[PDB]
Design a protein around this ligand. Structure first.
Ligand code: OCW
Ligand code: K
Ligand code: K
Ligand code: K
Ligand code: K
Ligand code: K
Ligand code: K
Ligand code: K
Ligand code: K
Ligand code: K
Ligand code: K
Ligand code: K
Ligand code: K
Ligand code: K
Ligand code: K
Ligand code: K
Ligand code: K
Ligand code: K
Ligand code: K
Ligand code: K
Ligand code: K
Ligand code: K
Ligand code: K
Ligand code: K
Ligand code: MG
Ligand code: MG
Ligand code: MG
Ligand code: MG
Ligand code: MG
Ligand code: MG
Ligand code: MG
Ligand code: MG
Ligand code: MG
Ligand code: MG
Ligand code: MG
Ligand code: MG
Ligand code: MG
Ligand code: MG
Ligand code: MG
Ligand code: MG
Ligand code: MG
Ligand code: MG
Ligand code: MG
Ligand code: MG
Ligand code: MG
Ligand code: MG
Ligand code: MG
Ligand code: MG
Ligand code: MG
Ligand code: MG
Ligand code: MG
Ligand code: MG
Ligand code: MG
Ligand code: MG
Ligand code: MG
Ligand code: MG
Ligand code: MG
Ligand code: MG
Ligand code: MG
Ligand code: MG
Ligand code: MG
Ligand code: MG
Ligand code: MG
Ligand code: MG
Ligand code: MG
Ligand code: MG
Ligand code: MG
Ligand code: MG
Ligand code: MG
Ligand code: MG
Ligand code: MG
Ligand code: MG
Ligand code: MG
Ligand code: MG
Ligand code: MG
Ligand code: MG
Ligand code: MG
Ligand code: MG
Ligand code: MG
Ligand code: MG
Ligand code: MG
Lengths: 114, 209, 123, 118, 56, 5
RNA sequence: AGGACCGAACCGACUAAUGUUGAAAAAUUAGCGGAUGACUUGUGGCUGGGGGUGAAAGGCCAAUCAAACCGGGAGAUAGCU
RNA sequence: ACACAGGUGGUCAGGUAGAGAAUACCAAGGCGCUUGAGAGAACUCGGGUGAAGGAACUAGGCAAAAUGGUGCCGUAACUUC
RNA sequence: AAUUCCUUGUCGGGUAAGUUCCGACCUGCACGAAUGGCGUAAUGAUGGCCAGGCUGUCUCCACCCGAGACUCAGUGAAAU
RNA sequence: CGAUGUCGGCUCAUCACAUCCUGGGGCUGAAGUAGGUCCCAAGGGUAUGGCUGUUCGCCAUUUAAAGUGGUACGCGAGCUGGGUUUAGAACGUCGUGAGACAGUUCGGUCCCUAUCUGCCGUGGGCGCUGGAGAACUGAGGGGGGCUGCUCCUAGUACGAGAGGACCGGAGUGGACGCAUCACUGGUGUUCGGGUUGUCAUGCCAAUGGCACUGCCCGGUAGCUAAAUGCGGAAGAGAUAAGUGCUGAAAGCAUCUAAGCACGAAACUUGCCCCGAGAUGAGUUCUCCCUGACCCUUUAAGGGUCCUGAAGGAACGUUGAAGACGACGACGUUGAUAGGCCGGGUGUGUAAGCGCAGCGAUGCGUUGAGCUAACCGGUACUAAUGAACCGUGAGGCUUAACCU
């Protein structure tokens, strides 16, 4: 629909970087503790990307304090302040859900050197 | 207070500056033309009849074509009536825009729900299924008992049974208006409203307060 | 999405290791406990000399779930496991002195502020 | 429910549908007109016309791709050496369906389907 | 289940009152061949809308 | 054969 | 070596579903048990009705068994419908 | 009783994989099972997948799901050794 | 207790909760020595109970793939 | 007794009120909180497990509460078959025995294609008085009605203290219901990829068939819940128990006799849906038809010629509509469906060629190639000129206007 895609275009961010699954990403998100506002960083491997325009989302997996955590970020949400690619992963698949069944040295991702 | 007739364009999302995501239905509300006005003298009740959109001239039958000509307006896709409260007055050929809702906080939206065809009692009425496996014979999604023995010896009216589901008029009440874009004839309302995309909607100011 | 018969890990040093949910409190016919819901639990496994022993019946608060929690922008946080903190039946204050693994801001309320103060991380 | 779904099951399993249309498409290329039931004709459009579009650009990659679908080198040959050159300028609509009464033995509605520039 | 009483020839006929066929409302005449045919169907000699579509 | 009263 | 083990042919029939005016007056499908032995199977023979045979269930003796089938006594008798 | 998803002894015994007469795909050879065409409701049958939980189901883990091969390591109570 | 009516005897184990299960007591209505008593490795499509694993059995059902049911043409039953 | 299937469970319920909760009151051995007892009230609501064939009951943990009964001890042409209650076997006991036990124990075939009534849905006919297309009014009928916790008022009133409100307001939950698919997910045998065995395309390379979709990994549209929007109301009328004003009969007293006022989730409205076959068949707006002639039984009469309107149906392309009918869009004066073009999405760097390596394989061309149901366009294919049904100014009586 031309009506709706116009309503969406006026909201999308114009400066989201290129990143793809297996890249290690740092995301900074706004959090609020009453009268004060902060960024906190969430860093991990991108295991999934969903490219639905304004409804685009991506999933970051990290291990923290021994526990695996996944977070699904809405890419164009103004809660996401910044996205930064720390490292590039070489992987054959669009989705890396097999990394849920792995840990330690089995969960290593080769680097996309070239 | 009168309402307006629109079309369900679809659903999308609004992000607030403080970081909330609001689901919105997009309702297109082109200029509604008043085709007839009714009063106590001629009809015994006060109402306006409106039309909207456009219709191919080859499809407008003469009984209808003469009706719009009487008003002096072009044929829309249909005709609808709205009751008038006291102190509301309109004139034939008047055009009513989405700006009507500019001061309105909540609306009621009416539409025809999507059609499910012949639905079973589990889908239509949330009946519990019977046991899958402990020796059940041919009776997994069937209704069970439909009544009582000799007394009364009949099934009561209104017994919940399978049959047509959906494809019927539904009203959703007290939806928040998120935005009016009178420059592009859009009304955005929070949440979902009945019917498929491209279906006609009637929007009225919320009756409850 | 915890329910009766669900086994949970314990996110605290109270000495329990596995607990089973036996009642979702706070409502008639209530089906599920989410993050920050109180549950009645029973201790299925414990270390030899902790503060509590096998077969005790206590309250607990859910702090992590595999189902995760939804945030106001539609984002989701999920954990690899289900975990709870054991509480006293009467006062509902924590039994353990320290907390393990992350927790979530859903607990950031005056009732559990002690857990939020002790947690290694609040997501 | 069926809302917005496409295709026809034609009272066959999926593997049989695929084989049947592969055979029938080969026939409509070999003989530029065939007689069949009206519903099968309407589905064959969605099979044969995409092959003709592919044949409009002759390459080893496309010939192997056309072979994978038809599995007949005589059909592939005719596609690239005849039909592609014919329909080079036509923007779709390579076939025509003509309704043709009812089949004697079971009263099925029959139709002819033919290539337009026969 | 099965009937407790034999239905009448009256009740039989009422049920069958909906079984009547309908004839073709009217045939069409081909603008060149002059054969009658069903609308949107080729004529028996293989004409349609005034051109010989099949040589059969 | 059947279950009898 | 073995009334040994696993497992096809072969022999059986533990569970579930289907079927129940059946595809079938005892089956089908998916699993199941034995499978060199007190095994299984082809051809022929013998035992006859208060009799046979029975690793015994009143089980089997031609879709029939606390006494087979056919014909006769015979139109048994029926204080019953 | 049927152009009946049943029953019926012997002989022959190709290739690749495999321990194999199992199983998969094929050869020689033989068939597509004697009503079809459409549509793609409830519901019945036979199957596939399933978030979180994991017997809470039920008279009962019934039925499903799961285990499943070869080589090597290792292996308790009890015992008629 | 394949035997025990009263009886869910009483005590212990197992469970948050156990009329079933296991151990023990002896008040054995109404065990008991070849119509055998009491043990017992192995074995059993044997009865009961518990645990790990697994799971649409279930909370609570959703979707999908085939055969029917539905419409059209031909043939054409039955109980009652 | 030429058969009324018999316990419990499952599914589905429906009524009473002798009220479990929520609602309104009186008295109290009622300070507050919380209780006891009685009156009114049937709108809505009214646990999950362990044991047991169980009903029940006990126990564990909840809840505002876990009501009592009727309906063939509701419900087997709706399911089960644990128990009772056939044929096998055994125990205790009784009997010489065959056998027996309102004793125990293990095993043990649950059939039916719906004619009628009833009920849930969906059509055809005719009627409503000339025909046709729309929009309504609303007699009447149905759905809905639940309730916790926190905070403020207020640590106030009350109380020695402990403890701790009424009335009123706000927020946020549980169960239930409607809608929807933007989000998070499921599915996705019609999209892409990996891979085992074997057969084939002459062979290599590349592909295709079969093996449950062979096994698997992702996934578009649609559908969908665990996902996310909304709902229960406020208000009004007349009242129940109850509380009163003025007031005699009865110089007083008295809510009642005359008169007047308050009072509940019950009743009538308010909210949502159906609805003129509402035969009592309503209303409003618009559109269409303005010819002759004969005969008999002289009428609401039959027929011949001419005429064929508005509109409808049929046919075709079809749909978020659908079992079939029906309903909606479109039919060249056209985006209805398919194809095609561009995009998006999904998968994940195709084939061929070149280079490196002994080879498996890697790298370059290359985020390439392919890509269903999606989005925006485009007459390339199919949606024909017709024909068919439907008529020709629409009874009588009376009244009021106009003539
Ligand atoms: C209370 O119990 C019953 O309600 C009941 C029952 O409930 C499931 C099943 C059956 C089953 C049967 C019988 C029953 O009596 C029976 C009864 C009473 C028979 O008598 C039978 O009838 C052909 C027969 O003639 C000879 C036989 O054994 C000698 C049986 O095997 C028989 O064949 C059969 O199937
Ligand atoms: K215990
Ligand atoms: K022999
Ligand atoms: K005899
Ligand atoms: K159909
Ligand atoms: K005894
Ligand atoms: K056995
Ligand atoms: K009787
Ligand atoms: K009360
Ligand atoms: K009281
Ligand atoms: K009530
Ligand atoms: K009842
Ligand atoms: K019963
Ligand atoms: K009956
Ligand atoms: K009747
Ligand atoms: K009601
Ligand atoms: K969705
Ligand atoms: K989806
Ligand atoms: K292959
Ligand atoms: K007085
Ligand atoms: K209320
Ligand atoms: K009417
Ligand atoms: K390449
Ligand atoms: K791509
Ligand atoms: Mg529909
Ligand atoms: Mg059966
Ligand atoms: Mg079944
Ligand atoms: Mg009656
Ligand atoms: Mg479509
Ligand atoms: Mg068929
Ligand atoms: Mg296959
Ligand atoms: Mg042996
Ligand atoms: Mg035998
Ligand atoms: Mg078998
Ligand atoms: Mg075997
Ligand atoms: Mg053995
Ligand atoms: Mg064996
Ligand atoms: Mg012999
Ligand atoms: Mg006997
Ligand atoms: Mg016999
Ligand atoms: Mg005798
Ligand atoms: Mg004599
Ligand atoms: Mg006689
Ligand atoms: Mg024969
Ligand atoms: Mg045959
Ligand atoms: Mg045969
Ligand atoms: Mg044989
Ligand atoms: Mg074989
Ligand atoms: Mg051959
Ligand atoms: Mg189907
Ligand atoms: Mg699951
Ligand atoms: Mg998945
Ligand atoms: Mg899972
Ligand atoms: Mg249980
Ligand atoms: Mg239960
Ligand atoms: Mg039990
Ligand atoms: Mg089993
Ligand atoms: Mg051991
Ligand atoms: Mg005990
Ligand atoms: Mg004992
Ligand atoms: Mg003895
Ligand atoms: Mg003796
Ligand atoms: Mg003994
Ligand atoms: Mg027929
Ligand atoms: Mg009788
Ligand atoms: Mg009362
Ligand atoms: Mg009311
Ligand atoms: Mg248990
Ligand atoms: Mg009963
Ligand atoms: Mg009954
Ligand atoms: Mg039994
Ligand atoms: Mg049984
Ligand atoms: Mg008997
Ligand atoms: Mg039955
Ligand atoms: Mg009404
Ligand atoms: Mg979508
Ligand atoms: Mg997904
Ligand atoms: Mg899949
Ligand atoms: Mg090769
Ligand atoms: Mg083959
Ligand atoms: Mg155009």
């Amino acid at each position: 629909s031309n009506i709706i895609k116009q309503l969406e275009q006026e909201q999308m961010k114009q400066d989201v970087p290129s990143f793809r699954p297996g890249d290690t990403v740092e995301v900074k998100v706004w959090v609020v503790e009453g009268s004060k506002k902060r960024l906190q960083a969430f860093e991990g491997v991108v295991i999934a990307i969903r490219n639905r325009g304004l409804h685009s989302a991506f999933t970051v997996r990290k291990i923290s304090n021994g526990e695996g955590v996944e977070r699904v970020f809405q890419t164009h949400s103004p809660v996401v302040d910044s996205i930064s690619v720390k490292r590039r992963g070489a992987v054959r698949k669009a989705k890396l859900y097999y990394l849920r069944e792995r840990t330690g040295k089995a969960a290593r991702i080769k680097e996309r050197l070239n | 207070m009168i309402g307006l007739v629109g079309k369900k364009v679809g659903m999308t999302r609004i992000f607030t500056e403080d970081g909330v995501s609001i689901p919105v239905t997009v309702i297109e509300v082109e200029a509604n033309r008043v085709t007839q006005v009714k009063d106590l003298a001629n009809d015994g009740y006060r109402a306006i009849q409106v039309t909207t959109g456009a219709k191919k001239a080859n499809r407008v039958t003469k009984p209808e074509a003469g009706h719009f000509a009487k008003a002096g307006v072009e044929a829309g896709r249909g005709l609808w009536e709205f009751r008038l409260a006291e102190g509301e007055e309109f004139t034939v050929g008047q055009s009513i825009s989405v700006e009507l809702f500019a001061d309105v906080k909540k609306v009621d939206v009416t539409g025809t729900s999507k059609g499910k065809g012949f639905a079973g009692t589990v889908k239509r009425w949330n009946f519990r299924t019977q046991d899958a496996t402990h020796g059940n014979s041919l009776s997994h999604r069937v209704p069970g008992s439909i009544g009582q023995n000799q007394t009364p010896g009949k099934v009561f009216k209104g017994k919940k049974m399978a049959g047509q589901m959906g494809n019927e008029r539904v009203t959703v009440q007290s939806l928040d208006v998120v935005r009016v874009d009178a420059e592009r004839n859009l009304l955005l309302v929070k949440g979902a409203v009945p019917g498929a995309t491209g279906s006609d909607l009637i929007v009225k100011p919320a009756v409850k307060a | 999405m915890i329910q009766e018969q669900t086994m949970l890990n314990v996110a605290d040093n109270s000495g329990a290791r596995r607990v089973m949910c036996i009642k979702v409190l706070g409502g008639s016919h209530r089906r599920y406990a989410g993050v920050g819901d109180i549950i009645k639990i029973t201790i299925k496994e414990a270390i030899p000399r902790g503060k509590v022993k096998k077969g005790d019946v206590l309250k607990a608060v859910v702090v992590r779930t595999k189902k995760g929690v939804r945030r106001p922008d539609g984002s989701v946080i999920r954990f690899d496991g289900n975990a709870c903190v054991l509480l006293n039946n009467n006062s509902e204050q924590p039994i353990g002195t320290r907390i393990f693994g992350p927790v979530t801001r859903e607990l950031r309320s005056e009732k559990f502020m002690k857990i939020i103060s002790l947690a290694p991380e609040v997501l | 429910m069926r809302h917005r779904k496409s295709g026809r099951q034609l009272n066959r399993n999926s593997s049989h549908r695929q084989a049947m249309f592969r055979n029938m498409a080969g026939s409509l290329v070999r003989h530029e007109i065939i007689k069949t039931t009206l519903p099968k004709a309407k589905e064959l459009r969605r099979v044969v016309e995409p092959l003709i579009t592919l044949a409009k650009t002759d390459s080893v990659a496309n010939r192997r791709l056309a072979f994978a679908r038809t599995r007949d080198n005589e059909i592939v040959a005719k596609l690239f050496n005849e039909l592609g050159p014919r329909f080079a300028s036509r923007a779709g609509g390579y076939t025509r369906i003509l309704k043709c009464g009812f089949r004697a033995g079971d009263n099925a509605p029959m139709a002819y389907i033919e290539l337009v520039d026969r | 289940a099965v009937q407790q009483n034999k239905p009448t020839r009256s009740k039989r006929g009422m049920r069958r009152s909906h079984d009547a066929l309908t004839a073709v409302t009217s045939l069409s005449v081909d603008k060149t061949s002059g054969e009658k045919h069903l609308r949107h169907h080729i004529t028996a000699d293989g004409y349609y809308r005034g051109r010989k579509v099949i040589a059969k | 054969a059947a279950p009898q009263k």
